[PDB]
Amino acid sequence: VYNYQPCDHPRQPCDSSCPCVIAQNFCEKFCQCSSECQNRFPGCRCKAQCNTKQCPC
Amino acid sequence: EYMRLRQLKRFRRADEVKSMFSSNRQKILERTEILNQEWKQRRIQPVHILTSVSSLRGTRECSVTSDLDFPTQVIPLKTLNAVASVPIMYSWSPLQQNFMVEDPECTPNIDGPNAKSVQREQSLHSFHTLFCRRCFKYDCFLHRKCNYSFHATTETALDNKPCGPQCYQHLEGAKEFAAALTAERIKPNIEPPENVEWSGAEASMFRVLIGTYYDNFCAIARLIGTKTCRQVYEFRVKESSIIHVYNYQPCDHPRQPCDSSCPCVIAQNFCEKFCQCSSECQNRFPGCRCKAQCNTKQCPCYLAVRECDPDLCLTCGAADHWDSKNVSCKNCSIQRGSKKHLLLAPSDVAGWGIFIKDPVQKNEFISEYCGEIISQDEADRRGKVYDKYMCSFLFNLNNDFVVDATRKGNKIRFANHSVNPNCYAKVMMVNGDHRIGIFAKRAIQTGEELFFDYRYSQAD
Ligand SMILES: [Zn+2]
Ligand SMILES: [Zn+2]
Ligand SMILES: [Zn+2]
Ligand SMILES: [Zn+2]
Ligand SMILES: [Zn+2]
Ligand SMILES: [Zn+2]
Ligand SMILES: [Zn+2]
Ligand SMILES: [Zn+2]
Ligand SMILES: [Zn+2]
Ligand SMILES: [Zn+2]
Ligand SMILES: [Zn+2]
Ligand SMILES: [Zn+2]
Ligand SMILES: [Zn+2]
């Protein structure tokens, strides 16, 4: 597991041509890609405590 | 020989049919006598059958030509006023859920005076062969599986003191014998036992209940009739001396856990509650700890395109308030069966069309495309039958499942087709079964006919 290296490419999907995809890592807030990026990690909507395997994180 | 017997049988049949015809004729004569008496009770108004008028409206006249030696009578045509027609359609059976289409004999009854003892195959085989654990039904139509069953085939405290009547524990030196005989099943009862006759039904019920309650005596005597606890221990002692998404098919393999040797792993499906694996199974689906509405594309349920299992997704809203309106979680509408009202009217394009009564926002549940579940070959046959008159309703649900709503469906069967659809359908796995839901592509207006693109289905 590698640290999330940000990618900056507006109006460009991250799919087979992005370092985040090559590293099997999600685009984070620091990534400057489109807000509807494919690899963007959806914020988990836990009620609390985020300690069950239920949360994707 | 054979010819004589055949002739005798033919003569007997002829006599029988002659007598039957005579009797039926007598009955018919009586009924026609009373019928003609009723007919002659009142006469009819004189129908002179006048020849209307002589060109009252000055229209065309009928040239009724008599082929015999008679003149051609003339009569003006009295035209009949027109009546509005209705588009053609066939009858169908209303339906809400799915309906799949197929494509020494027994132990006596404890009910009634007749009874005996059943121990060849325990005492519980009528209610075990027929089972549908998914929705708790007997011989369910929804799940007509292989059904291997056929032909109708724990710590607790000791009951100290004689609760109510005399107890088996209160007997002098019986508990150690009980411990001994359960130890071997992996002072003591020296007093002679009583001799009381026991009915076959009572014995069978006692055996069945002892198969579960085990050392419990007070409760098993309470449920049974009479059945003294000392006598219960007596029978217990006597018996020892005497002797591409697929359906979520449940897994019950005890040879190995669910890992490369399970149908669920083969079908890449989460082991739901009906699976008989360990509670810590790898394929077990973690629930949602979602705050509300379960519509974040992230939600593992939404990522997996799945519904919310009531036994797993607990705080999400898939279990609380079962008998109420739509729950907080928006990924449970199809499971509850709640949809939007639809209407039927002549379509502005062709034939009939479904017009929704209320507006639907973007990605909002409207209806479920239910009907009759048929196999792929059965789907082909049904589609050919329906297209014989150039109208098909076949839809794709799973890899080997097809929903058809021609002879049995809902109002959502009449979906119009347009290059700019106002609705779209997606398949979601609800409680281990696959269902088709109807969703609006845009904020459709009130009363507009719903549009559905047929390219997604097998038939476009
Ligand atoms: Zn990128
Ligand atoms: Zn990205
Ligand atoms: Zn990125
Ligand atoms: Zn998170
Ligand atoms: Zn968290
Ligand atoms: Zn979380
Ligand atoms: Zn069922
Ligand atoms: Zn399994
Ligand atoms: Zn399983
Ligand atoms: Zn399992
Ligand atoms: Zn969820
Ligand atoms: Zn949910
Ligand atoms: Zn869920």
From Swiss-Prot, chain A:
Q: Give the function comment from the record.
A: Polycomb group (PcG) protein. Catalytic subunit of the PRC2/EED-EZH2 complex, which methylates 'Lys-9' (H3K9me) and 'Lys-27' (H3K27me) of histone H3, leading to transcriptional repression of the affected target gene. Able to mono-, di- and trimethylate 'Lys-27' of histone H3 to form H3K27me1, H3K27me2 and H3K27me3, respectively. Displays a preference for substrates with less methylation, loses activity when progressively more methyl groups are incorporated into H3K27, H3K27me0 > H3K27me1 > H3K27me2.
Put simply, this protein is called Histone-lysine N-methyltransferase EZH2
User: What does the record say about PTM?
Assistant: Phosphorylated by AKT1. Phosphorylation by AKT1 reduces methyltransferase activity. Sumoylated.
- Specify the species: Homo sapiens (Human)
Q: In which tissues is it expressed?
A: In the ovary, expressed in primordial follicles and oocytes and also in external follicle cells (at protein level). Expressed in many tissues. Overexpressed in numerous tumor types including carcinomas of the breast, colon, larynx, lymphoma and testis.
The protein's gene is named EZH2
User: Where in the cell is the protein located?
Assistant: Nucleus
Family per record: Belongs to the class V-like SAM-binding methyltransferase superfamily. Histone-lysine methyltransferase family. EZ subfamily.
Disease per UniProt entry: Weaver syndrome: A syndrome of accelerated growth and osseous maturation, unusual craniofacial appearance, hoarse and low-pitched cry, and hypertonia with camptodactyly. Distinguishing features of Weaver syndrome include broad forehead and face, ocular hypertelorism, prominent wide philtrum, micrognathia, deep horizontal chin groove, and deep-set nails. In addition, carpal bone development is advanced over the rest of the hand.
Describe, as the record does, how this protein assembles with itself and its partners: Component of the PRC2/EED-EZH2 complex, which includes EED, EZH2, SUZ12, RBBP4 and RBBP7 and possibly AEBP2. The minimum components required for methyltransferase activity of the PRC2/EED-EZH2 complex are EED, EZH2 and SUZ12. The PRC2 complex may also interact with DNMT1, DNMT3A, DNMT3B and PHF1 via the EZH2 subunit and with SIRT1 via the SUZ12 subunit. Interacts with HDAC1 and HDAC2. Binds ATRX via the SET domain. Interacts with PRAME. Interacts with CDYL. Interacts with CLOCK, BMAL1 and CRY1. Interacts with DNMT3L; the interaction is direct.
Concerning what turns on (or off) its expression, the entry says: Expression is induced by E2F1, E2F2 and E2F3. Expression is reduced in cells subject to numerous types of stress including UV-, IR- and bleomycin-induced DNA damage and by activation of p53/TP53.
Source organism superkingdom: Eukaryota
